[PDB]
Design a protein around this motif. Structure first.
Motif, short mmCIF file in Angstrom:
data_model
loop_
_atom_site.label_atom_id
_atom_site.label_comp_id
_atom_site.label_asym_id
_atom_site.label_seq_id
_atom_site.Cartn_x
_atom_site.Cartn_y
_atom_site.Cartn_z
N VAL A 31 11.85 -7.80 -7.28
CA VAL A 31 11.52 -7.09 -8.56
C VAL A 31 10.03 -6.72 -8.56
CG1 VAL A 31 11.48 -9.37 -9.70
CG2 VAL A 31 11.41 -7.30 -11.09
N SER A 32 9.71 -5.54 -9.08
CA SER A 32 8.32 -5.04 -9.29
C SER A 32 7.63 -5.89 -10.37
CB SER A 32 8.30 -3.58 -9.68
OG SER A 32 7.05 -3.22 -10.25
N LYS A 33 6.51 -6.53 -10.02
CA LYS A 33 5.68 -7.33 -10.96
C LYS A 33 4.60 -6.43 -11.57
CE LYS A 33 4.61 -11.09 -13.19
NZ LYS A 33 5.43 -11.38 -14.39
N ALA A 78 0.86 -1.20 0.00
CA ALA A 78 0.00 0.00 0.00
C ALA A 78 0.89 1.25 0.00
CB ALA A 78 -0.91 -0.03 1.20
N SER A 79 1.08 1.87 -1.17
CA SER A 79 1.95 3.06 -1.36
C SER A 79 1.19 4.35 -1.04
CB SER A 79 2.53 3.09 -2.75
OG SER A 79 3.40 4.20 -2.92
N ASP A 80 1.91 5.38 -0.60
CA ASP A 80 1.43 6.78 -0.51
C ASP A 80 0.98 7.28 -1.89
OD1 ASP A 80 2.02 7.13 2.24
OD2 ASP A 80 4.10 7.70 1.77
N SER A 81 1.60 6.74 -2.95
CA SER A 81 1.46 7.21 -4.36
C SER A 81 0.02 7.08 -4.87
CB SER A 81 2.42 6.46 -5.26
OG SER A 81 2.18 5.06 -5.20
N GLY A 82 -0.85 6.37 -4.14
CA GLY A 82 -2.21 6.00 -4.59
C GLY A 82 -2.20 4.67 -5.31
N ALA A 83 -1.04 4.00 -5.33
CA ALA A 83 -0.81 2.71 -6.01
C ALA A 83 -0.82 1.57 -4.99
CB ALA A 83 0.49 2.72 -6.76
N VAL A 84 -1.39 0.43 -5.40
CA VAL A 84 -1.09 -0.92 -4.86
C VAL A 84 -0.05 -1.54 -5.79
CG1 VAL A 84 -2.11 -3.13 -4.13
CG2 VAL A 84 -3.50 -1.05 -4.06
N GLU A 85 1.15 -1.85 -5.28
CA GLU A 85 2.24 -2.47 -6.09
C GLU A 85 2.50 -3.89 -5.56
OE1 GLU A 85 5.46 0.35 -6.25
OE2 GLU A 85 5.23 1.00 -4.16
N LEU A 86 2.71 -4.84 -6.48
CA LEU A 86 3.02 -6.26 -6.18
C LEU A 86 4.47 -6.54 -6.59
CD1 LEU A 86 2.32 -9.11 -5.36
CD2 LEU A 86 1.28 -9.47 -7.60
N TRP A 87 5.32 -6.83 -5.60
CA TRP A 87 6.76 -7.14 -5.77
C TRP A 87 6.97 -8.66 -5.72
CZ3 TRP A 87 10.64 -3.43 -6.59
CH2 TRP A 87 10.21 -2.11 -6.53
N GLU A 88 7.33 -9.25 -6.86
CA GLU A 88 7.69 -10.69 -6.97
C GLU A 88 9.11 -10.88 -6.42
OE1 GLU A 88 4.95 -13.08 -9.02
OE2 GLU A 88 5.59 -13.16 -6.92
#
Ligand SMILES: Cc1cncc(NC(=O)C(=O)N2CCCC[C@@H]2c2cccn2C)c1
Ligand SMILES: CSC[C@H]1O[C@@H](n2cnc3c(N)ncnc32)[C@H](O)[C@@H]1O
Ligand SMILES: [Cl-]
Lengths: 625, 310
Positions: free
Chosen positions: B98-100, B79-89
């Motif tokens: 690495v960012s998936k 859960a990023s401040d950026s407004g993004a949900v990011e999934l790191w493999e």
């Protein structure tokens, strides 16, 4: 084109971020001055003693950049009106800390949320801050057109969104603002950043916000539909609002992420600039009066005072008005000398208050259009203008025009006149004392003579402008009544304001006045049916005048003479604003009063509440005879 | 330190999650100074954290991390401040991260994520007041719900049902969801509107009950079935930021707060353990899968404390 800024609640490196948004095409950036998630304790150990720094360095930007490019945002954990004592106290300290830091940087504006009904402690802290040291940074109150609660999706099974009519319920958002601003005693440093959602409210709610000090409009990326090609655009309703907000010269703030991912952000922005450059361009009037919007001025008294050369210059630089005067005389000449009499009958025509002689010229253009013969007197008391008349007369007019250099009330005329022609009207018709002046001059009009104009009528309409109420309040002066500024009219191009009812007529004068016992005093009771909730701040005055038969001048917005820019509306303010609820009648009373020496207006609101009587005995404002 | 692993770990430790195999996940944000960002760290040695040198893997995120959760064994959901949900493999050898995918779908800080019982789907919560349900396979948002009138504090997936999760907001509502109903949300919670909810933990076994902590430092045990607040206790002096149930067959409740104290509680919410060892805010906890009486906490004081819970 538009002035617009970008709202972010995430800035990893203030340097690179500000670079991106300048590159995108933005004028400024709304960002937090402390990290939004960096909650801080001030009283209980140990969190109290957290090693600093508390936020990033002021050295990261030039003083110039801070002053111009950065709008601060209050950290969203700061809740001064928490029901929890401990959270109140931290938010009290944290708010002062964030505001005091905004002041330290010299930020030009700082955003605060209005997002619940109770902001009593918030107002207290801001009002306290405003009165600590001195800065002149602006406070933008972020208020939604529609509360977030009345904008939610109807997806809580046991708590549905009531599908009934609630006229006041869907206005609550303005009451939030109104109460906050009232608590802060209408501080000139507190304005509205108005937040727009995907569903606009009803027009009447957007009509509350009409007279309010909107410095910004916030557009979330949500509300933007998508056109065929893939770009972002707005509903035809959202577009009407933008066109309205552009005439109020607000700054636009884009907030939230890019939801039109196959484009740059400068598409959202490009669309505003498309909308801006695609509005009906400013008409002759809007172009003329472009720097005067809600600028208060003392009403001229061309009787008591001698008008300056450059004042007469603007009266004269108005062709539409003098065309009407030309036509009115032309028509009067033809209804007075029959065709068979045309070279036996010279009409004696007297200009009363001739200035530098724009009416004298219209009277000559009149007669050399109706092909009849005229003898012109030009009566003017301002000897500075009389210099201009006599130079004109010697150089061009010749003996046709006699320049008289005296008061029309004092002048003994060699012969009586067919037609007297005057331009002695103020923004409220009779407020430059056209009545008293023409009464004193009618004895040298023939017992069958015409006055041009023959009739004028003043009009009043109640207005809401928390903006103009403040410009008046800001006119307090040392060495006089501290409330004098409210008991006097101002000429002003009313711009940011809300007309609460249609104008009704107030005072009417006829010339000549054959009445055996002439009385120019008046009492006029007016009832203004109001069909909206609002706050009364004063009464706009306008006028219409009949020059001759069906030739007329008006500044009444409805019947306004097109492209005529010699008069702005007058404003009669009231000391204390008065709440008016939908259905209530505003009843105002105006008196015209007089001595031998002075003429003036007293006035009072009698419904739905009573006001103090304004300007009793012309104590604050008089018009010299 | 490993390749492409930052030299320095950001001060403010937000997340602390054990994998099944005993390795420690750390998320951390920079909440002050020039550069406002975050980082992910895998520690196969749980006793060598927070130290950046003796870690298995680490990476730099564009922006700070507000919440963190494992997706199974190799997946890390952020859960990023950026407004993004990011999934790191995670890597084959598990030597770099690495960012998936990284999807900017929320309009404000993403404050909470939770993986649904399946493990193919997650629900996020943001300060933009939206709740979203993700397909982690397809890397897109299935559902978008504005249930709330205020920023979403906490979203917690049900242990066993892929269509149920609790959420709670500063609008004072605790919402029991079920994506099968055509009105998915249902407002439950105590009789009178009380103090704002700040944290949610389902019971790991009695699928019908959960706990919520409020901003007044009061933990509350609730039945959705009974839908009437059976039990509660004034555990903390300040806001309850996290509730974590132990892996025991009859489990313990760890309670972490902004009064910089950890509590551990029995099933009737009486106090068994408490720790001042943290001298800034307590931001997370996970229990050791290997030692069921070991508990790990992280603070904003950059401390990783390990506790022996009686
Ligand atoms: C023929 C005549 C007789 N009396 C008054 C006026 N006009 C105004 O009294 C008036 O409204 N004025 C002038 C004094 C500055 C303010 C305002 C103005 C600024 C620029 C254009 N105008 C219109 C005209
Ligand atoms: C606004 S144009 C009004 C003009 O009429 C003139 N005026 C006003 N009152 C009188 C008066 N009583 N006698 C002569 N001129 C007047 C003023 O000096 C001004 O030029
Ligand atoms: Cl003035």
């Amino acid at each position: 084109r538009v002035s617009s800024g970008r709202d972010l609640n995430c800035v990893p490196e203030i340097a690179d971020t500000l670079g991106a948004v300048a590159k995108q095409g933005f004028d400024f950036l709304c960002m937090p001055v402390f990290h939004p998630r960096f909650k801080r304790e001030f009283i209980q150990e140990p969190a109290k003693n957290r090693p600093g720094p508390q936020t990033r360095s002021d050295l990261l930007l030039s003083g110039r950049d801070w002053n111009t490019l950065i709008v601060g945002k209050l950290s969203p954990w700061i809740r001064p009106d928490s029901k929890v004592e401990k959270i109140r106290r931290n938010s009290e300290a944290a708010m002062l800390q964030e505001l005091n830091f905004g002041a330290y940087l010299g930020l030009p504006a700082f955003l605060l949320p209005l997002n619940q009904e109770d902001n009593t402690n918030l107002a207290r802290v801001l009002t306290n801050h405003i009165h600590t040291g001195h800065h002149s940074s602006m406070f933008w109150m972020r208020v939604p057109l529609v509360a977030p609660e009345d904008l939610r999706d109807d997806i809580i099974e046991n708590a549905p969104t009531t599908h009934t009519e609630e006229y006041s319920g869907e206005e609550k958002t303005w009451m939030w603002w109104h109460n906050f601003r009232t608590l802060c005693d209408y501080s000139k440093r507190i304005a509205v950043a108005l937040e727009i959602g995907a569903d606009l409210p009803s027009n009447h709610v957007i009509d509350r916000w009409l007279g309010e000090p909107i410095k910004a409009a916030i557009l979330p990326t949500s509300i933007f539909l998508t056109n065929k090609k893939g770009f972002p655009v707005l509903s035809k309703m959202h577009q009407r609002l933008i066109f309205r907000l552009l005439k109020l010269e607000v700054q636009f703030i884009i907030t939230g992420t890019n939801h039109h991912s196959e484009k740059e952000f400068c598409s959202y922005l490009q669309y505003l600039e498309y909308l801006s450059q695609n509005r009906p361009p400013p008409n002759a009037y809007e172009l003329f009066a472009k720097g005067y919007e809600d600028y208060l001025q003392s009403p001229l008294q061309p009787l008591m005072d001698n008008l300056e050369s450059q004042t007469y210059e603007v009266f004269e630089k108005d062709p539409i008005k003098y065309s009407q005067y030309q036509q009115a005389i032309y028509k009067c000449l033809l209804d007075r000398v029959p065709e068979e009499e045309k070279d036996t009958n010279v009409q004696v025509l007297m200009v009363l208050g001739a200035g530098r002689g724009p009416l004298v010229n219209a009277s000559l253009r009149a007669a050399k259009q109706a092909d009849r013969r005229i003898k012109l007197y030009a009566v003017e008391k301002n000897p500075n203008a009389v210099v201009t008349l006599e130079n004109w007369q010697f150089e061009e007019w010749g003996s046709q025009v006699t320049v008289v250099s005296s008061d029309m009330r004092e002048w003994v005329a060699p012969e009586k006149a067919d037609i007297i022609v005057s331009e002695l009207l103020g923004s409220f018709a009779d407020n430059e004392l056209s009545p008293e002046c023409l009464d004193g001059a009618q004895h040298f009009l023939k017992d069958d003579g015409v006055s041009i104009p023959g009739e004028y009528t003043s009009f009043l309409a109640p207005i809401s402008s928390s903006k103009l109420y403040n410009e008046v309040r800001a006119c307090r002066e040392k060495d006089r009544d501290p409330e004098a500024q409210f008991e006097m009219p101002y000429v002003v191009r009313l711009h940011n304001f809300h007309q609460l009812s249609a104008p009704q007529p107030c005072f009417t004068f006829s010339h000549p006045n054959r009445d055996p016992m002439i009385d120019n005093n008046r009492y006029c009771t007016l009832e203004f049916p109001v069909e909206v909730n609002t706050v009364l701040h004063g009464f706009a005055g306008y006028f219409e005048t009949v020059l001759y038969q069906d030739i007329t001048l008006s500044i009444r917005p409805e019947t306004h003479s097109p492209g005529m820019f010699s008069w702005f509306p007058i404003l009669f303010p009231i000391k204390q604003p008065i709440t008016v609820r939908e259905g209530q009648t505003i009843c105002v009373r105006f008196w015209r009063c007089s001595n031998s020496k002075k003429v003036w207006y007293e006035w009072a609101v009698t419904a739905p509440v009573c006001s103090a009587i304004h300007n009793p005995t012309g104590r604050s404002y008089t018009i010299g005879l | 330190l490993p390749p492409n692993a930052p030299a320095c770990m950001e001060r403010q430790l937000e997340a602390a999650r054990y994998r099944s195999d005993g390795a420690l996940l750390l998320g951390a944000s920079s909440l002050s100074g020039r550069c406002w960002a975050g980082s992910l760290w895998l520690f196969k040695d749980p006793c060598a954290a927070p130290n950046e040198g003796f870690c298995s893997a680490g990476v730099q995120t564009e922006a700070g991390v507000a919440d963190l959760t494992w997706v199974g064994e190799r997946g890390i959901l952020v859960a990023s401040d950026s407004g993004a949900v990011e999934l790191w493999e995670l890597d084959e050898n598990e030597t770099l991260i690495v960012s998936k995918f990284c999807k900017y779908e929320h309009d404000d800080i993403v404050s909470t994520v939770s993986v649904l019982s399946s493990g193919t789907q997650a629900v996020s919560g943001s300060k933009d007041i939206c709740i979203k349900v993700w397909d982690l396979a397809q890397q897109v948002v299935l559902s978008s719900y504005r249930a709330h009138a205020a920023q979403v504090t906490c979203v917690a997936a049900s242990p066993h049902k892929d269509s149920v999760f609790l959420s709670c907001s500063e609008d004072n509502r605790i919402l029991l969801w079920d994506t099968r109903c055509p009105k998915p949300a249902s407002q439950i919670g105590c009789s009178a509107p009380g103090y704002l909810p700040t944290s949610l933990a389902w019971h790991p076994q009695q699928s019908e009950v959960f706990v919520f902590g409020d901003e007044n430092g009061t933990v509350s045990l609730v039945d959705t079935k009974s839908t009437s607040c059976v039990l509660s206790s004034a555990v903390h002096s300040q806001c309850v930021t996290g509730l974590v149930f132990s892996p025991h067959s009859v489990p313990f409740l760890a309670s972490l707060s902004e009064d910089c104290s950890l509590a551990v509680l029995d099933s009737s919410l009486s106090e068994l353990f408490r720790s001042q060892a943290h001298r800034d805010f307590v931001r997370d906890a996970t229990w050791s899968p290997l030692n069921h009486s070991l508990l790990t906490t992280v603070g904003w004081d950059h401390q990783v404390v390990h506790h022996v819970v009686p």
